A paper describes a structure:
In the pathogenesis of Alzheimer’s disease, the overexpression of glycogen synthase kinase-3β ([name]-3β) stands out due to its multifaced nature, as it contributes to the promotion of amyloid β and tau protein accumulation, as well as neuroinflammatory processes. [name]-3β abnormal activity leads to hyperphosphorylation of tau protein which results in the formation of neurofibrillary tangles and the loss of its fundamental property–stabilization of microtubules. [name]-3β activity also plays a significant role in the modulation of immune response within the central nervous system (CNS). Given the multifaceted role of [name]-3β in the processes contributing to the onset and progression of Alzheimer’s disease, it represents an excellent biological target in the pursuit of disease treatment.
We identified compound 36, demonstrating an IC50 of 70 nM against [name]-3β. The most potent compound developed in this study is 36 with an IC50 of 70 nM. Kinetic studies confirmed a competitive type of inhibition, allowing for the determination of a Ki value (Ki = 60.3 nM) consistent with the IC50 (for details including Lineweaver–Burk and Cornish–Bowden plots see Figures S26 and S27 in the SI). The catalytic domain of the new [name]-3β crystal structure adopts the characteristic bilobal fold. The electron density map shows the phosphorylation of Tyr216 that supports the active conformation of the A-loop, forming interactions with Arg220 and Arg223.44,45 The ligand’s electron density unambiguously determines the geometric orientation of compound 36 in the catalytic pocket of the enzyme. The compound occupies the ATP-binding site formed in the hinge region between the N- and C-lobes of the kinase domain. The aminopyridine fragment is oriented toward Asp133, Tyr134, and Val135 of the hinge region. An additional favorable contribution stabilizing the ligand in the hinge region is provided by the CH–O H-bond between the Asp133 main chain oxygen and the C(2) hydrogen of the pyridine ring, reflecting the tridentate harboring motif in the adenine binding region. The thiophene and the 1,2,4-oxadiazole rings are coplanar, with the latter located in the phosphate-binding region of [name]-3β where the residues Lys85, Asp200, and Phe67 create the anchoring motif. The 1,2,4-oxadiazole ring is capturing Lys85 with an H-bond and the thiophene ring of the inhibitor forms favorable London dispersion interactions with Cys199 and Val70. Although the position of the ligand in the pocket is entirely clear from the solved electronic density, the relative orientation of terminal groups cannot be unequivocally determined unless the resolution is <1.0 Å.47 Two orientations are distinguishable for the 1,2,4-oxadiazole: (i) the O atom in oxadiazole is exposed to the solvent, leaving the N–C bond oriented toward catalytic Lys85 (N–C orientation); (ii) the O atom in oxadiazole is turned toward the catalytic Lys85 (N–O orientation).
Author numbering: 36 to 119, 122 to 295, 300 to 381
Amino acid sequence: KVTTVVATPGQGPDRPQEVSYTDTKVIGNGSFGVVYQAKLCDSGELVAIKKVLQDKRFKNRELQIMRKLDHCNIVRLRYFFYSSKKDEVYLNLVLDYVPETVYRVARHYSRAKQTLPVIYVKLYMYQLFRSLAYIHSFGICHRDIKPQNLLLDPDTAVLKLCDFGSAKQLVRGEPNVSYICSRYYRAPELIFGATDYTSSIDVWSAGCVLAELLLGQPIFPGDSGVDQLVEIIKVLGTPTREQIREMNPNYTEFKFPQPWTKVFRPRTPPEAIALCSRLLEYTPTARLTPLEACAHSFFDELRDPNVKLPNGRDTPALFNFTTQELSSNPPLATILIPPH
Ligand SMILES: O=C(Nc1cc(-c2ccc(-c3ncon3)s2)ccn1)C1CC1
């Protein structure tokens, strides 16, 4: 049937208006609770409702971040409402329903042994670094960059950052947990038990999803944090004593105490391999900033005026830059916004 509730509009002021929707179905689950998909009775727009349980004697870090974020490549928080077993409540996050994720379209290609077109790979990754450079400016680290958290529309080719329950405003001094992120996309510093990491861990996970697109399979598949490090050393090579010191110092076992360059599939664009190399660096500082990655030579086909999607539709919102977005090296604005 239909259901109406009083929700405070996200990002906007505290003016709880009434929202009514129908046709609710579960599109996902998790430890937080469950995410639904409903249809707003007005305009018939399909949304997503994330029912996360929360103790009333606190404040959801996700909700605080989502209300302070507004970017084309980030799923906007439309509204939010509570619908609660004593000192607890269920926080429901109403967001725009993006119809697909990068993992699903990547799996559909992997099920047929076909590489995703580089045009798709270049547009998705660029929209990822654009959302990263946005959230990284405010000092927020997603801490869960994965293809399942990279929503995408098939027609408009618009990608948006999905989850934010693992994100935290990384401040100086404040120690944060190490065992974060998905294993296949976890940075090496987190495996070594570093509590002083920066937002460059999202860049490592960005380099991992890039390789998964140019290879049809996860680049670093392990069953444990230690096993994940063996996959990294097998490809990236043995980290030197400086890089092991650039991250947290710790001793670790291994299957053996043993850097193949030819790892990517044939016909892989060399410009992407150069980008993926600057992203998957042992040293967290050598990793390109999300804005520095946007200005890479691999993202030059999109910066061309005559760029167009396969279905004839023009390039989606590729520019639309803000001063906050360019807080890291504003000089690079001419490469992020060509005269085109
Ligand atoms: O899920 C699907 N669309 C979908 C999802 C979301 C989400 C937002 C937050 C989410 C979450 N947080 C933790 O865990 N999940 S999920 C938003 C919009 N559309 C269908 C198409 C595949």
